[PDB]
Amino acid sequence: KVEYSEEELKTHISKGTLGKFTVPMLKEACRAYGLKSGLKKQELLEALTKHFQD
Give the C-alpha separation, 42 to 21, whole Å.
Answer: 10
Closest CA relative to residue 53, chosen from 27, 38, 39, 33: 33
Closest CA relative to residue 22, chosen from 42, 5, 7: 42
Domains with residue ranges and CATH for the chain: 1-54 (1.10.720.30)
**Burial call 6-36: b when 16+ CB within 10 Å, e when fewer:** eeebeebbeeeebeebeeeebbebbeebebe
